[PDB]
Amino acid sequence: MENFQKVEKIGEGTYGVVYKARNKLTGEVVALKKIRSTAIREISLLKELNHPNIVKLLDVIHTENKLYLVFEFLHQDLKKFMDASALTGIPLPLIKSYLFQLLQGLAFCHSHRVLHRDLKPQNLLINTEGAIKLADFGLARAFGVPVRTYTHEVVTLWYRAPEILLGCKYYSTAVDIWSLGCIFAEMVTRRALFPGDSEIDQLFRIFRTLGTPDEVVWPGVTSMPDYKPSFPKWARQDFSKVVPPLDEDGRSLLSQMLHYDPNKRISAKAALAHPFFQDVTKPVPHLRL
Ligand SMILES: CCCC(=O)Nc1n[nH]c2c(F)c(F)c(-c3ccccc3)cc12
């Protein structure tokens, strides 16, 4: 656009290129996404769902075969922070604060019947004040999640809920709770929980750890579109081996976020009340920009 002076290319989204840009009339520093009627309607609605833990959508510009999304700018993402902290780990008080803030953002969006559907460390942004925000919220409802991005990069399957993998057509808010639990486990262990490299590999990795689901733990599972009776029958592993050395409060919360049945899986609202959050504080991270 004419009103923006581009400083640099900052990344590649699922849909388009992301630039760091400066507004010419306001001097405001923003993140500018360049993409490529019903989709425009859905995205215009996103200008109203404002929360401190949701990246602000400042403006929507549709012109000459392009869709421009003007976003609030944050200096770092959780993926790079996790990589930079790989040797010593992220301290437990910070993991806790980040999880607490993320659950607040989810509780707000879910209360307005808006789900993310594609949470990953790459779309979780952080600042020097100890804040963490969810980016790209609502874009999956508007365009759907493709197999590959606009650059042909493979879209990650690692944080995908089992009901999605099993062919359900109606996703609930429980899908975001699953992804966030996978992220929680990764911050604690410094390794991906379920690093699948295909839909079947992802599903069988979930099954190997949590046990192959049945009509006992998940009513209706055997009737789901992509369910096969030929699926190998794996035993559930003990949670103490899943995320060591996380305490019992953390392990209890993680087990509830990873329930197979989307109706049994803890809500963002109920997660905020879990005893794990009794001693939450707001520490600041050690970022060098
Ligand atoms: C090192 C982080 C620098 C950065 O890109 N900051 C950003 N500031 N604001 C942003 C934003 F609103 C975004 F939507 C994305 C984004 C993230 C993942 C996938 C697609 C888009 C990134 C940023």
Short mmCIF file of C-alpha atoms and ligand atoms in Angstrom, two decimals:
data_model
loop_
_atom_site.label_atom_id
_atom_site.label_comp_id
_atom_site.label_asym_id
_atom_site.label_seq_id
_atom_site.Cartn_x
_atom_site.Cartn_y
_atom_site.Cartn_z
CA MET A 1 0.00 0.00 0.00
CA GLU A 2 0.84 3.72 -0.53
CA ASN A 3 0.35 4.72 3.15
CA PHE A 4 3.05 2.23 4.32
CA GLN A 5 6.85 2.35 4.07
CA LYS A 6 8.18 -1.24 4.30
CA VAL A 7 11.12 -1.64 6.68
CA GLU A 8 11.77 -5.41 6.08
CA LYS A 9 10.22 -8.83 5.28
CA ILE A 10 9.61 -10.51 8.65
CA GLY A 11 8.16 -13.90 7.62
CA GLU A 12 5.88 -16.16 5.58
CA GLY A 13 2.38 -16.94 6.81
CA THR A 14 -0.02 -19.71 5.79
CA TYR A 15 -1.73 -17.23 3.36
CA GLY A 16 0.86 -14.57 2.49
CA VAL A 17 4.10 -12.63 3.18
CA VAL A 18 4.44 -10.66 6.46
CA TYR A 19 6.33 -7.36 6.47
CA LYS A 20 7.40 -4.93 9.18
CA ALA A 21 6.05 -1.55 8.01
CA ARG A 22 5.64 2.08 9.10
CA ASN A 23 2.42 4.06 8.51
CA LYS A 24 3.24 7.40 6.78
CA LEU A 25 0.42 9.54 8.32
CA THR A 26 0.49 8.14 11.93
CA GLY A 27 4.15 6.97 12.17
CA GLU A 28 2.75 3.74 13.72
CA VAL A 29 4.98 0.61 13.37
CA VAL A 30 2.83 -2.37 12.25
CA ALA A 31 2.96 -5.94 10.81
CA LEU A 32 1.60 -5.93 7.21
CA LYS A 33 0.26 -9.23 5.67
CA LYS A 34 -0.23 -9.33 1.83
CA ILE A 35 -2.61 -12.10 0.60
CA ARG A 36 -2.39 -13.34 -3.05
CA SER A 37 -16.73 -11.67 -0.50
CA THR A 38 -17.79 -14.17 2.26
CA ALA A 39 -14.12 -14.22 3.47
CA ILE A 40 -14.04 -10.34 3.56
CA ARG A 41 -17.27 -10.38 5.68
CA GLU A 42 -15.76 -12.88 8.22
CA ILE A 43 -12.44 -10.96 8.45
CA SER A 44 -14.10 -7.49 8.82
CA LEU A 45 -15.92 -8.92 11.92
CA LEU A 46 -12.47 -9.71 13.49
CA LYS A 47 -11.79 -5.89 13.91
CA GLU A 48 -14.29 -6.01 16.85
CA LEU A 49 -12.87 -8.97 18.84
CA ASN A 50 -10.30 -7.08 20.94
CA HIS A 51 -8.48 -8.54 24.02
CA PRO A 52 -4.97 -7.87 25.56
CA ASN A 53 -3.91 -11.49 24.71
CA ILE A 54 -5.15 -11.32 21.04
CA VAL A 55 -2.94 -9.56 18.37
CA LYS A 56 -4.99 -6.49 17.29
CA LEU A 57 -6.36 -6.33 13.70
CA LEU A 58 -5.97 -2.59 12.95
CA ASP A 59 -7.33 -2.54 9.36
CA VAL A 60 -8.50 -4.65 6.38
CA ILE A 61 -7.59 -3.36 2.85
CA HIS A 62 -9.03 -5.13 -0.24
CA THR A 63 -7.58 -3.69 -3.52
CA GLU A 64 -6.32 -4.78 -7.01
CA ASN A 65 -6.39 -8.63 -6.56
CA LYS A 66 -4.87 -8.36 -3.02
CA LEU A 67 -6.01 -8.59 0.63
CA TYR A 68 -3.97 -6.48 3.11
CA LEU A 69 -4.25 -7.18 6.87
CA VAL A 70 -2.73 -4.47 9.14
CA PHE A 71 -1.69 -5.93 12.53
CA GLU A 72 -0.20 -4.80 15.88
CA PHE A 73 3.61 -5.49 15.87
CA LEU A 74 5.49 -7.67 18.45
CA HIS A 75 9.33 -8.24 18.30
CA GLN A 76 9.53 -12.05 18.86
CA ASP A 77 7.56 -15.35 18.48
CA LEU A 78 7.45 -18.36 20.94
CA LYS A 79 9.19 -20.74 18.47
CA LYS A 80 12.42 -18.61 18.41
CA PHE A 81 12.21 -18.01 22.20
CA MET A 82 11.93 -21.84 22.78
CA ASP A 83 14.98 -22.40 20.47
CA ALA A 84 17.02 -19.63 22.22
CA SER A 85 16.13 -21.24 25.64
CA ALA A 86 16.82 -24.91 24.53
CA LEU A 87 19.97 -25.33 26.71
CA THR A 88 18.55 -24.27 30.14
CA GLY A 89 14.77 -24.36 29.53
CA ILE A 90 12.12 -21.66 30.02
CA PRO A 91 11.64 -21.18 33.85
CA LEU A 92 8.42 -22.76 35.26
CA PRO A 93 6.99 -19.36 36.53
CA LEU A 94 7.19 -17.99 32.91
CA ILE A 95 5.70 -21.18 31.27
CA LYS A 96 2.83 -20.81 33.85
CA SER A 97 2.31 -17.07 33.13
CA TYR A 98 2.36 -17.72 29.34
CA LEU A 99 -0.16 -20.62 29.68
CA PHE A 100 -2.43 -18.48 31.97
CA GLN A 101 -2.42 -15.53 29.47
CA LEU A 102 -3.01 -17.88 26.48
CA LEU A 103 -6.02 -19.48 28.26
CA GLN A 104 -7.49 -15.95 28.91
CA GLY A 105 -7.25 -15.12 25.18
CA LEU A 106 -8.91 -18.48 24.29
CA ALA A 107 -11.68 -17.95 26.95
CA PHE A 108 -12.47 -14.50 25.40
CA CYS A 109 -12.61 -15.71 21.73
CA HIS A 110 -14.51 -18.92 22.57
CA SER A 111 -17.12 -16.77 24.50
CA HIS A 112 -17.82 -14.98 21.16
CA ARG A 113 -17.95 -18.41 19.34
CA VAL A 114 -14.63 -17.74 17.49
CA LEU A 115 -11.99 -20.51 17.32
CA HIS A 116 -8.39 -20.39 16.01
CA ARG A 117 -8.01 -24.01 14.63
CA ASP A 118 -4.24 -23.66 13.86
CA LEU A 119 -2.33 -22.79 17.10
CA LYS A 120 1.46 -23.32 16.91
CA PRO A 121 4.55 -21.69 18.63
CA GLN A 122 5.19 -19.70 15.39
CA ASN A 123 1.85 -17.74 15.76
CA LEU A 124 2.26 -16.95 19.53
CA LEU A 125 4.01 -13.56 19.94
CA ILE A 126 5.89 -12.12 22.94
CA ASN A 127 7.16 -8.69 24.14
CA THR A 128 9.72 -7.42 26.78
CA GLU A 129 6.86 -6.77 29.32
CA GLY A 130 6.11 -10.51 29.85
CA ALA A 131 3.00 -10.47 27.60
CA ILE A 132 2.04 -13.25 25.10
CA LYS A 133 -0.55 -12.89 22.31
CA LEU A 134 -2.33 -15.15 19.78
CA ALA A 135 -1.81 -14.11 16.08
CA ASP A 136 -3.93 -15.17 12.98
CA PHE A 137 -7.11 -15.78 15.10
CA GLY A 138 -10.18 -16.27 12.86
CA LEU A 139 -8.28 -16.59 9.52
CA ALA A 140 -8.93 -20.42 9.37
CA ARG A 141 -12.73 -19.86 9.55
CA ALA A 142 -12.45 -17.41 6.60
CA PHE A 143 -10.07 -19.42 4.29
CA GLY A 144 -9.75 -22.94 5.77
CA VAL A 145 -6.44 -24.64 6.61
CA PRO A 146 -4.60 -25.89 3.47
CA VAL A 147 -2.20 -28.88 3.15
CA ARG A 148 0.58 -26.46 2.01
CA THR A 149 1.15 -22.69 2.52
CA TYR A 150 1.35 -20.11 -0.39
CA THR A 151 5.18 -20.89 -0.59
CA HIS A 152 4.33 -24.71 -0.81
CA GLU A 153 5.67 -25.25 2.77
CA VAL A 154 3.97 -28.19 4.61
CA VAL A 155 1.46 -26.89 7.22
CA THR A 156 2.40 -28.57 10.60
CA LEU A 157 0.20 -31.44 11.89
CA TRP A 158 1.89 -31.55 15.37
CA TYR A 159 -0.82 -29.59 17.25
CA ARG A 160 -3.87 -31.03 15.39
CA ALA A 161 -6.75 -32.41 17.55
CA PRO A 162 -7.68 -36.16 17.04
CA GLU A 163 -11.32 -35.40 16.08
CA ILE A 164 -9.93 -33.34 13.10
CA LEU A 165 -7.62 -36.23 12.05
CA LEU A 166 -10.58 -38.68 12.38
CA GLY A 167 -12.72 -36.72 9.85
CA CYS A 168 -15.24 -34.72 11.96
CA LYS A 169 -16.97 -31.90 9.96
CA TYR A 170 -17.95 -29.82 13.01
CA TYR A 171 -15.03 -28.57 15.12
CA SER A 172 -15.69 -27.22 18.58
CA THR A 173 -13.62 -24.80 20.75
CA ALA A 174 -12.00 -27.99 22.27
CA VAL A 175 -9.65 -28.10 19.18
CA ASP A 176 -7.71 -25.02 20.50
CA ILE A 177 -7.49 -26.53 24.03
CA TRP A 178 -5.78 -29.65 22.53
CA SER A 179 -3.19 -27.52 20.56
CA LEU A 180 -2.39 -25.41 23.65
CA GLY A 181 -1.83 -28.60 25.73
CA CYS A 182 0.62 -29.86 23.06
CA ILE A 183 2.44 -26.43 23.30
CA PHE A 184 2.44 -26.59 27.15
CA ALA A 185 4.12 -30.05 27.04
CA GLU A 186 6.75 -28.77 24.52
CA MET A 187 7.75 -25.70 26.70
CA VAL A 188 8.24 -28.06 29.70
CA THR A 189 10.22 -30.86 27.90
CA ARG A 190 12.04 -28.76 25.18
CA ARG A 191 10.82 -31.38 22.62
CA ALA A 192 7.62 -31.64 20.48
CA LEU A 193 4.96 -33.92 22.08
CA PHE A 194 3.63 -35.48 18.82
CA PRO A 195 5.96 -34.54 15.85
CA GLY A 196 3.94 -36.30 13.09
CA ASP A 197 5.09 -36.20 9.44
CA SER A 198 1.79 -37.40 7.89
CA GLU A 199 -1.85 -37.60 9.06
CA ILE A 200 -1.54 -41.31 9.90
CA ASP A 201 1.88 -40.80 11.64
CA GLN A 202 0.34 -37.95 13.73
CA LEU A 203 -2.71 -40.05 14.75
CA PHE A 204 -0.56 -43.16 15.61
CA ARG A 205 1.88 -40.98 17.68
CA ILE A 206 -1.14 -39.69 19.74
CA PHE A 207 -2.38 -43.35 20.07
CA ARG A 208 1.09 -44.70 21.18
CA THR A 209 1.22 -42.21 24.15
CA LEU A 210 -2.47 -41.75 25.13
CA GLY A 211 -3.71 -45.24 24.14
CA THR A 212 -5.85 -46.18 21.12
CA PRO A 213 -9.33 -44.62 21.86
CA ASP A 214 -12.43 -46.86 22.15
CA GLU A 215 -16.18 -46.56 22.95
CA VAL A 216 -15.25 -46.57 26.70
CA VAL A 217 -13.16 -43.34 26.69
CA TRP A 218 -14.76 -41.69 23.61
CA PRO A 219 -18.49 -42.46 22.83
CA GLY A 220 -19.04 -42.44 19.03
CA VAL A 221 -15.31 -42.72 18.02
CA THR A 222 -15.78 -46.03 16.05
CA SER A 223 -18.53 -44.27 13.97
CA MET A 224 -16.27 -41.32 12.87
CA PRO A 225 -15.54 -40.96 9.09
CA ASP A 226 -11.79 -41.84 9.04
CA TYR A 227 -11.92 -44.38 11.89
CA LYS A 228 -10.74 -47.90 10.90
CA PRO A 229 -11.22 -51.08 13.06
CA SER A 230 -7.75 -52.13 11.67
CA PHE A 231 -6.02 -49.35 13.78
CA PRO A 232 -3.34 -50.99 16.07
CA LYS A 233 -4.43 -51.20 19.73
CA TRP A 234 -1.79 -49.41 21.90
CA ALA A 235 -1.81 -49.12 25.71
CA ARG A 236 -1.89 -45.71 27.48
CA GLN A 237 1.49 -44.64 28.88
CA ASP A 238 1.87 -43.23 32.43
CA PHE A 239 1.77 -39.38 32.46
CA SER A 240 4.90 -39.18 34.74
CA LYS A 241 6.94 -40.45 31.69
CA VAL A 242 5.12 -37.98 29.29
CA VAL A 243 6.22 -34.62 30.81
CA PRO A 244 9.02 -35.10 33.43
CA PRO A 245 9.77 -33.32 35.83
CA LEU A 246 6.44 -31.31 35.81
CA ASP A 247 4.58 -31.41 39.21
CA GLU A 248 1.19 -33.15 39.88
CA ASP A 249 -0.86 -29.89 39.42
CA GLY A 250 0.70 -29.39 35.96
CA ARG A 251 0.26 -33.08 35.05
CA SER A 252 -3.44 -32.99 36.16
CA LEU A 253 -4.12 -29.86 34.01
CA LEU A 254 -2.27 -31.33 30.97
CA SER A 255 -4.27 -34.64 31.21
CA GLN A 256 -7.58 -32.65 31.16
CA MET A 257 -6.48 -30.54 28.11
CA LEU A 258 -5.56 -33.82 26.27
CA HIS A 259 -8.86 -35.73 26.86
CA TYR A 260 -9.91 -37.69 23.73
CA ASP A 261 -13.63 -36.80 24.08
CA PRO A 262 -14.12 -33.12 23.03
CA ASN A 263 -17.05 -32.91 25.56
CA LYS A 264 -14.84 -34.09 28.46
CA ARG A 265 -11.82 -31.89 27.45
CA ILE A 266 -11.46 -28.90 29.89
CA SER A 267 -12.72 -25.48 28.68
CA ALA A 268 -10.42 -22.39 28.67
CA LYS A 269 -12.76 -20.92 31.40
CA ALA A 270 -12.46 -24.00 33.70
CA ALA A 271 -8.65 -24.25 33.04
CA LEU A 272 -8.16 -20.71 34.50
CA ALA A 273 -9.62 -22.00 37.85
CA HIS A 274 -7.27 -25.09 38.01
CA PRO A 275 -5.08 -25.32 41.22
CA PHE A 276 -1.94 -25.09 38.92
CA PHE A 277 -2.74 -21.36 38.67
CA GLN A 278 -2.83 -20.69 42.48
CA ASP A 279 0.75 -19.24 42.52
CA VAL A 280 0.78 -17.50 39.03
CA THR A 281 2.92 -14.35 38.74
CA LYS A 282 3.94 -12.23 35.73
CA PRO A 283 7.78 -12.51 35.26
CA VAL A 284 9.60 -10.88 32.33
CA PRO A 285 11.70 -12.83 29.74
CA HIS A 286 15.37 -12.05 28.90
CA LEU A 287 15.00 -10.93 25.22
CA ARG A 288 17.82 -9.34 23.20
CA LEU A 289 16.37 -7.58 20.12
C1 LIG B 1 9.79 -12.65 15.22
C2 LIG B 1 8.33 -12.20 15.16
C3 LIG B 1 8.17 -11.01 14.21
C4 LIG B 1 6.74 -10.92 13.67
O1 LIG B 1 6.45 -11.47 12.61
N1 LIG B 1 5.89 -10.21 14.44
C5 LIG B 1 4.59 -9.97 14.20
N2 LIG B 1 3.98 -8.89 14.68
N3 LIG B 1 2.76 -8.96 14.46
C6 LIG B 1 2.46 -10.07 13.78
C7 LIG B 1 1.25 -10.59 13.32
F1 LIG B 1 0.11 -9.88 13.46
C8 LIG B 1 1.21 -11.84 12.70
F2 LIG B 1 0.02 -12.31 12.29
C9 LIG B 1 2.38 -12.59 12.53
C10 LIG B 1 2.31 -13.90 12.00
C11 LIG B 1 2.87 -14.96 12.72
C12 LIG B 1 2.81 -16.27 12.24
C13 LIG B 1 2.14 -16.54 11.05
C14 LIG B 1 1.55 -15.50 10.34
C15 LIG B 1 1.62 -14.18 10.82
C16 LIG B 1 3.59 -12.08 13.04
C17 LIG B 1 3.63 -10.80 13.62
#
